């Protein structure tokens, strides 16, 4: 159909830390399918407020 928008993708970029396995589907169809959407880097998503919440033991 058509790539997403910089409004939904942008908020999804930093969500890569909260999703963990889900956002990988976007980063692939975004950074390799047309990253012209947003203007923010991929490294910026190195830290977020939503920890992995996986290794909490």
UniProtKB/Swiss-Prot annotation:
Site feature location: Required for activity: 22
Phenotype for residue 50 to S: No neuron activity in the VNO
Reported effect, residue 47 to E: Reduced neuron activity in the VNO
Tissue-level expression: Expressed in the extraorbital lacrimal gland from where it is secreted into tears.
Signal recorded as keyword: yes
Cystine connections: 18-50
Subcellular localization(s) per the UniProt record: Secreted
Consequence recorded when altering residue 18 to S: No neuron activity in the VNO
GO annotation, biological process: positive regulation of female receptivity
GO CC annotation terms, alphabetical: extracellular space
Impact after mutating residue 22 to R/Q: No neuron activity in the VNO and marked reduction in the accessory olfactory bulb
Superkingdom of origin: Eukaryota
Keywords: Behavior, Disulfide bond, Pheromone, Secreted, Signal
GO molecular function: pheromone activity
Homology family: Belongs to the exocrine gland-secreted peptide family.
Known function: Male-specific phermone which is recognized by the Vmn2r116/V2rp5 receptor in the vomeronasal organ (VNO) and enhances female sexual receptive behavior (lordosis) upon male mounting, resulting in successful copulation.
Assembly and oligomerization: Monomer.
Protein name: Exocrine gland-secreted peptide 1
Origin species: Mus musculus
Taxonomy of the source species: Eukaryota, Metazoa, Chordata, Craniata, Vertebrata
Residues of the full protein shown: 48 to 102 of 102
């Amino acid at each position: 159909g058509s790539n997403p928008d910089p409004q939904e993708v942008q908020r999804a970029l930093a969500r890569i830390l909260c999703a963990l396995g889900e956002l990988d589907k976007l980063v692939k169809d975004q950074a390799n399918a047309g990253q012209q959407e947003f203007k923010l880097p991929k490294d910026f998503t190195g830290r977020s407020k939503c920890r992995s919440l996986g290794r909490i033991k």
